[PDB]
Amino acid sequence: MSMSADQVEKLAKNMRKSCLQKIAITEELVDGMRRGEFPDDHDLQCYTTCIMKLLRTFKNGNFDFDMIVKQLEITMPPEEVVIGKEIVAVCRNEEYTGDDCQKTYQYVQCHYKQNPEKFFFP
Numbered sequence: 248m249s250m251s252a253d254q255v256e257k258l259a260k261n262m263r264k265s266c267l268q269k270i271a272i273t274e275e276l277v278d279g280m281r282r283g284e285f286p287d288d289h290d291l292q293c294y295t296t297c298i299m300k301l302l303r304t305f306k307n308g309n310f311d312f313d314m315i316v317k318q319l320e321i322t323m324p325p326e327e328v329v330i331g332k333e334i335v336a337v338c339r340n341e342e343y344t345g346d347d348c349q350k351t352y353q354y355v356q357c358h359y360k361q362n363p364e365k366f367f368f369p
């Protein structure tokens with residue numbers, strides 16, 4: 248089964264808390280991504296890697312697309328799952344370059360670009 252909205256929010260907030268402290272950036276900077284604010288800020292980039300590593304969606308220098316699909320299946324509203332799979336289907340085929348922080352940040356931006364209105368990142 249899938250997790251309820253409030254359980255998704257709780258886990259996201261706790262992952263954020265952990266990574267914000269570790270990476271030493273502000274909540275404002277993380278919240279900016281949902282507003283389409285993607286500065287070339289290496290610390291924000293590394294925050295994205297911290298979160299994806301927690302979710303097991305990035306590991307050993309590469310995306311784990313099987314786990315990205317599993318995570319979206321367990322956390323998205325059911326009426327959004329197919330649309331989410333279609334976003335992953337597009338973004339998985341873009342080349343990601345640079346260090347791990349740069350790669351995950353680029354992937355997150357690809358997700359945003361496919362649907363800015365509904366974008367969410369912990």
Ligand SMILES: CCCCNS(=O)(=O)c1ccccc1
Nearest residue numbers: 255258259318322323367369
């Ligand atoms: C908003 C609904 C989609 C959430 N998906 S998530 O991968 O960001 C995620 C968030 C929180 C816990 C686990 C995964």
Ligand SMILES: CCCCNS(=O)(=O)c1ccccc1
Nearest residue numbers: 299304315318319355358367
């Ligand atoms: C798409 C939701 C499942 C994957 N979760 S994620 O945190 O890696 C993530 C990557 C990119 C955008 C949002 C969340």
